[PDB]
Amino acid sequence: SVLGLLGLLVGYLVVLMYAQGEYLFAITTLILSSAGLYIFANRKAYAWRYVYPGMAGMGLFVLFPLVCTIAIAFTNYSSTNQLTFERAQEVLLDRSWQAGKTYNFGLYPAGDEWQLALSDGETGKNYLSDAFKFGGEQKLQLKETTAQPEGERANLRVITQNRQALSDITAILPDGNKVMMSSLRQFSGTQPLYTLDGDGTLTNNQSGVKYRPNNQIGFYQSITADGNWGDEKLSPGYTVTTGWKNFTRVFTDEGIQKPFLAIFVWTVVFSLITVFLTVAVGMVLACLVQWEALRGKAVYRVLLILPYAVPSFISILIFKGLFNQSFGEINMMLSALFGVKPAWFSDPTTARTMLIIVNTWLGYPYMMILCMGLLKAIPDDLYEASAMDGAGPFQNFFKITLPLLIKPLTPLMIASFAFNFNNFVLIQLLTNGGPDRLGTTTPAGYTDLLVNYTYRIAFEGGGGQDFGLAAAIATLIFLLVGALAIVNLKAT
C-alpha cells in the first residue's frame, strides 16, 4: 500500500540520474533500490527486510567502488585528463585576449574579507561582487547596484602588496563580459579567444585557427581544412574512453612490467613471512599466557596486547622516527654497543628487514588473541589424559595442541595473508616507498607492495598521475588477492 509513495522517488530520481550524465551511478541507484522496494513490499520475504540495510552499505560503499575501479580500467583518467569534454570547453571559452574596455575599480573590504566593486563609465550602471579572500584564482559573480559602495577605497600600497592575488581575479558581469585587472586603477573587459557554433568546433579569434575535439587522446586538436590530425594541441585535456591499452602496456614489455613483476614477488613474500612469524609467535605466547602453572597471567596478558592495542598510525610512525639513519634513538644505541649503523631507509635489503620487524610487532598480538580464544575450544580432558600417560609440556604442544589447531587456523591463516598482501597502512606511512627504483616511467620502490604501487601511480606528488592505469592494475590485483577467497571458503 505504501509502494505508491516509495515508487515516486525510485524513477523520478533515476531519470534525473539518467539525465545530466552520470550513467555509471544511475544503474546502482535503480538496481539496489528496486530490489529494496520489492523486499519491503510483500510479506512473502520477511527475512530479507533485515539483511537489506546491511547490503545497502555493502552494495554502495564496497561493491560499487569495486565495480567502478574495474570500469576506470578501460577509461583514460589521468592528470592531463581529469574532467570530461563538456567541462573542458568552457574553460577554453574563458581564455581570452584583451579588448580594452574601461572599468575603474575600488577595493572595499567587508568584515574579515575583501569585496570587489567595479564602476562602468559607458552604461553608467555600477557593478558589485561578493565577499572573497585573496588566494589563487577565482571567478566572482557581480550583481547590479546603482548606489555608490560604502567605505573608502584601499590606497596604492594595499593593492600593490596583494597584486598577485588581485590580478588572478577573473570576475564576471551580469551581462556576460569577463573582467580582469589591467592596472592598479583599472580593470578591463575582454572578448573570448574562442567561439563555439553548431558543431563542437572551436575557432580562435586571434590566430584564426580552428580546433576540433580529438577523442583518440582526449585533447583539442587543429587541422588546416584537411585530414584529422596535425598541428598544435591544447592540454586542458578531457577524460576519454579507451581500449585495453592500459592492460597491454603492463603485459607487453615496456618499463612498467619490470618493477611490477619484481614487487609482486616481494609482496607475496612479505605477507608469507609476516603470517609465518606472527602465527608462530602468537601461538607460542597464547599457550604460555593461559598456562595453568603461572603467576601473573592477568598482568602478562595486557602488556602483550599493547602493540595491537595502540593504533596503527601512531605505532608505525614512532618506528619511522626511531629507525632514521643519521638521527633516531635506535641507531644511536646500535652505534653504542655495536659499531654498525644499518641503513633502514636507503639500503634495499636492510629496509625490508625493518618492515617485517614492525609488522610482526603489530601482527603477533592479534594472532595471540585469535589463537588464545581458539585454544579454549580444546577440552582440558585431552591434556589431563596425556598427563596420565606421562606426556611432557613440549610433547603436548607438538602432538596434541598444534595438529589440532592447524585445522581451524587454516582459513584464518590465509586470511591474514590476504590482509598483509594489501597492507597499505604500513608501507605508505613508514617508508613511503623506501628505496626508490631507478629507471622507471612510473613511481616505484624496492619496498612497495602492489596496493602502494597502484596508489603511487594515481596520487604521486607530480609523478604523472594515471588514474586509469592505477585502476587497471588494481583490477589485476582484484583477480589475484580477491579470487583467493575460493580456497578460503570452498576448501575450508
Partner 1 sequence: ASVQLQNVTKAWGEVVVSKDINLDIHEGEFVVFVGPSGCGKSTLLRMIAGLETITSGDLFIGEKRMNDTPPAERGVGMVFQSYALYPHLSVAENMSFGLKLAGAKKEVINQRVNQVAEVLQLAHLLDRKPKALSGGQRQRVAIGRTLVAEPSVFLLDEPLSNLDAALRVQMRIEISRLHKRLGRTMIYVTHDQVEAMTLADKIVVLDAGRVAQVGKPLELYHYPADRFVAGFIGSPKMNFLPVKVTATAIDQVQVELPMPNRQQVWLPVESRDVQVGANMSLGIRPEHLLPSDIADVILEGEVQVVEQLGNETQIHIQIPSIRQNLVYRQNDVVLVEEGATFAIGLPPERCHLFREDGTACRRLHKEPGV
Partner 2 sequence: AMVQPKSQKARLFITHLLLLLFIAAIMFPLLMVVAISLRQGNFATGSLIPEQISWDHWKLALGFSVEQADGRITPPPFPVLLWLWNSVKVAGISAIGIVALSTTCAYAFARMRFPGKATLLKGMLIFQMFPAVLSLVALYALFDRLGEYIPFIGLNTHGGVIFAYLGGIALHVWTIKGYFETIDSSLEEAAALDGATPWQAFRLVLLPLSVPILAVVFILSFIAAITEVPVASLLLRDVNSYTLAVGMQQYLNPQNYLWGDFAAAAVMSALPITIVFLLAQRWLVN
Ligand X SMILES: CCCCCC/C=C\CCCCCCCCCC(=O)O[C@H](COC(=O)CCCCCCCCCCCCCCC)COP(=O)(O)OC[C@@H](O)CO
131 binds, among ligand X, partner 1, partner 2, none (CB under 5 to 8 A by kind): none
**Cβ proximity to partner 2, 108 vs 300, nearer residue:** 300
How crowded is residue 454: how many other Cβ atoms within 10 Å of its Cβ? 23
**Cβ proximity to partner 1, 302 vs 388, nearer residue:** 388
247 in contact with ligand X (CB under 6 A): no
The 74-103 site mask, x for binding partner 2 (CB under 8 A), equals: ---x--------------------------
482 in contact with partner 2 (CB under 8 A): yes
Q: Which of residues 387-406 bind ligand X (CB under 6 A)?
A: 393-394, 396-397
Q: Site for partner 2 (CB under 8 A): which residue of 99, 303, 378, 487? A: 303
Q: Which of residues 249-288 bind ligand X (CB under 6 A)?
A: 284, 287-288
- Is there a contact between 242 and 76 (Cβ–Cβ < 8 Å)? yes
345 binds, among partner 1, ligand X, partner 2, none (CB under 5 to 8 A by kind): none
**Distance of alpha carbon 369 from alpha carbon 21, whole angstroms:** 50
Burial annotation 51-89 (CB, 10 A radius, 16+ → b, else e)? ebeeeeeebeeeebeeeebeebbbbbbbebbeeebeebb
The 448-477 site mask, x for binding partner 2 (CB under 8 A), equals: ---x--xx--xx-------x--xx--x--x
Q: Look up cell 519491503; give the residue.
A: 40
Q: Which of residues 193-252 bind partner 2 (CB under 8 A)?
A: none
Using left for φ > 0, alpha for ψ between -120 and 50, and beta otherwise, residue 435 falls in beta
Q: Site for partner 2 (CB under 8 A): which residue of 328, 348, 463, 464? A: 328
**Distance of alpha carbon 45 from alpha carbon 104, whole angstroms:** 71
Per DSSP, the three-state class of 183 is coil
41 in contact with partner 2 (CB under 8 A): no
The 288-307 site mask, x for binding ligand X (CB under 6 A), equals: x--xxx--------------
72 in contact with partner 2 (CB under 8 A): yes
**Distance of alpha carbon 240 from alpha carbon 18, whole angstroms:** 19
Q: Look up cell 571567478; give the residue.
A: 139
Smallest gap from Cβ 400 to partner 1, in A, equals 7
Q: Which of 241, 217, 242, 212 is nearest to 227 (CA)?
A: 212
Smallest gap from Cβ 399 to partner 1, in A, equals 7
How crowded is residue 465: how many other Cβ atoms within 10 Å of its Cβ? 20
